[PDB]
Design a protein around this ligand. Sequence first.
Ligand SMILES: C=CC1=C(C)/C(=C/c2[nH]c(/C=C3N=C(/C=C4\NC(=O)[C@H](C)\C4=C\C)C(C)=C\3CCC(=O)O)c(CCC(=O)O)c2C)NC1=O
Ligand SMILES: [Cl-]
Length: 230
Amino acid sequence: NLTELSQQLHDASEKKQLTAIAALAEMGEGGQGILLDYLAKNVPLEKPVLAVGNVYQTLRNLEQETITTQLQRNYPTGIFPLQSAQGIDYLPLQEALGSQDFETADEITRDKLCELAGPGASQRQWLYFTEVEKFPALDLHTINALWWLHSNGNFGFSVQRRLWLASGKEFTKLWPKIGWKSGNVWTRWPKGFTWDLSAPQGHLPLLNQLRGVRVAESLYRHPVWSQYGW
Ligand SMILES: C=CC1=C(C)/C(=C/c2[nH]c(/C=C3N=C(/C=C4\NC(=O)[C@H](C)\C4=C\C)C(C)=C\3CCC(=O)O)c(CCC(=O)O)c2C)NC1=O
Ligand SMILES: [Cl-]
């Protein structure tokens, strides 16, 4: 029933929205038209809204010519403002995430964090924890919003942070939870990682532990998360 499923999407229960979206996407032109109209009334986002990301990404994932064309024409930069306190271009990150190319998105995210830190980090291609502490909140918000909106809330530094808090801030308990260690075995980069949504919650983006936890801790303690309600 398209009428009842559209009503379910326009009601306020997020869990019932998500089931309606999945059902509508499998109902051809009528269901997909309801989803496209929903996007049109809710994009561009101001605050990240998981349902809106799920609608967009569900439609992208159909990989049908006309819907893909319509989405690219109407939302050429995606559904979320690509804002940067340093004028950085986040469209390549958005494009990788919209394609569900999470490995590429992980690589781009690492490159952008170095670019955000400055020439020293870009030259050495890794970060000092103090550079992380001084990141502008706006860029971290954009980066995280993209990861979260294009992963049904499963990926993002905000997701890792809340799992870390749930672990009593014990990093040795966090790694197994997000799939970065299995018992004694560190997950080998890149081939050991799971570059798709079957991965555990918080699996991406990656934070190499070769130089210790200081960068990750500085990132999870950064004021962006409380400031933007993550
Ligand atoms: C938490 C698990 C874990 C994560 C998240 C991980 C991610 C990760 N590891 C490497 C590289 C790497 N990782 C290692 C080794 C290791 N790195 C480690 O975190 C463990 C402690 C390890 C033990 C041998 C090495 C040697 C590289 C290559 C560094 C280089 O060649 O410059 C890279 C490429 C970026 C970079 O070089 O900094 C990523 C994204 N590897 C992991 O094992
Ligand atoms: Cl450091």
